[PDB]
Design a protein around this ligand. Structure first.
Ligand SMILES: Cc1cc2c(cc1C)N(C[C@H](O)[C@H](O)[C@H](O)COP(=O)(O)OP(=O)(O)OC[C@H]1O[C@@H](n3cnc4c(N)ncnc43)[C@H](O)[C@@H]1O)c1[nH]c(=O)[nH]c(=O)c1N2
Ligand SMILES: Nc1ncnc2c1ncn2[C@@H]1O[C@H](COP(=O)(O)O)[C@@H](O)[C@H]1OP(=O)(O)O
Length: 296
């Protein structure tokens, strides 16, 4: 039935009332000092106890209590490592986390609870995890699929997951031969997350991988408009539209809730030109499992 790799997945092996307690291995800042805000890549040991698949998320229960003396609510994080992991032994899990900092109503600076707890982790520290969670973002079963990946900021996480499996690993029963096209929206060149990894993949599989960046604060289109991901998409409109008409094309979108609208704004117009109602078409794609979304 499913077009996705849904068979034999684990879900909620670990729950909030009984989390898995793993330890931090590494925690590294991956953005430049230049960047607006910090993004960290961190890796935790789970010794093989969390049997996740690419596209899933884990919950993190940050240490401390809420204002009622209760444990904090879990926050979800997309897994940024493939099922084997960054060390290739299936015993670790990696997260890509932005440090959240804001000012409240009174001009006071507020730190996000889980995000700062995580970004401040030192190797050796323990962490409470739950999950795995999710089915929405699992990869398609078709090894020859066209997969378009639309991410903003940390939303690159699941795509990193997919791509490590696809291009940096050897699997007995899986060999990717389709076309993978990634579009990644970040603010600055010093925020191009995992670029070095993607450049290595591109060299390995030149015919199978396409890569496009939309550096919002540094790039403008012809009209001198800000280079959002949708902005960069339009430059490929005809092509993308055509890909969308095929049954073996899968779209995945992950990141800021805001990107969803912008994309719909470009699509409405693309389709109307062919006399198609984007809203119905999209509904059909969602149902056929070809249009997959995880925004937050
Ligand atoms: C499915 C899915 C998957 C992911 C994520 C969410 C979900 C649902 N997230 C987001 C993550 O779960 C979490 O919400 C953030 O890390 C922030 O949590 P803290 O506990 O740090 O903030 P905390 O919960 O302390 O504060 C959050 C609150 O900040 C407030 N806020 C934010 N900006 C504000 C502003 N400008 N002004 C006023 N108030 C403001 C809002 O009130 C908001 O509810 C994520 N994140 C991530 O970094 N990487 C990832 O991979 C993922 N993956
Ligand atoms: N509504 C939106 N649609 C598309 N891209 C967006 C939207 N809002 C913000 N962005 C961009 O998503 C990226 C998020 O990356 P990061 O987490 O490091 O900030 C930035 O390039 C940000 O651009 P900008 O902040 O210049 O508006």
């Amino acid at each position: 039935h499913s077009k996705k790799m849904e068979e034999g997945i684990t879900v909620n092996k670990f729950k909030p009332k009984t989390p898995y307690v793993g330890r931090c291995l590494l925690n590294t800042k991956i953005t430049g000092d230049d960047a607006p805000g910090e993004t960290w890549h961190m890796v935790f040991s789970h010794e093989g106890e969390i049997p996740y698949r690419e596209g899933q998320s884990v919950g993190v229960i940050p240490d401390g209590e809420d204002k009622n003396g209760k444990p904090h609510k879990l926050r979800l994080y997309s897994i940024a490592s493939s099922a084997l992991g960054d060390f290739g032994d299936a015993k670790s899990v990696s997260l890509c986390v932005k440090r959240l900092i804001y000012t409240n109503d009174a001009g006071e600076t507020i730190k996000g609870v889980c995000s700062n707890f995580l970004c401040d982790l030192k190797p050796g520290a323990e962490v409470k995890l739950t999950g795995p969670v999710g089915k929405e973002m699992l990869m398609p079963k078709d090894p020859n699929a066209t997969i378009i990946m639309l991410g903003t900021g940390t939303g690159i996480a699941p795509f990193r997951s997919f791509l490590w499996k696809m291009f940096f690993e050897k699997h007995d029963d899986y060999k990717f031969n389709g076309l993978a096209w990634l579009f990644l929206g970040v603010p600055t060149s010093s925020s191009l997350l995992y670029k070095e990894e993607f450049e290595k993949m591109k060299e390995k599989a030149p015919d199978n991988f396409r890569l496009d960046f939309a550096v919002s604060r540094e790039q403008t289109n012809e009209k001198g408009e800000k280079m959002y991901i949708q902005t960069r998409m339009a430059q490929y409109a005809v092509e993308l539209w055509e890909m969308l008409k095929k049954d073996n094309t899968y779209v995945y979108m992950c990141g800021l809730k805001g990107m969803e609208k912008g994309i719909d704004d470009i699509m409405v117009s693309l389709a109307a030109a062919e006399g198609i109602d984007w809203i119905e078409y999209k509904r059909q794609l969602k149902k056929a499992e070809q249009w997959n979304v995880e925004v937050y």
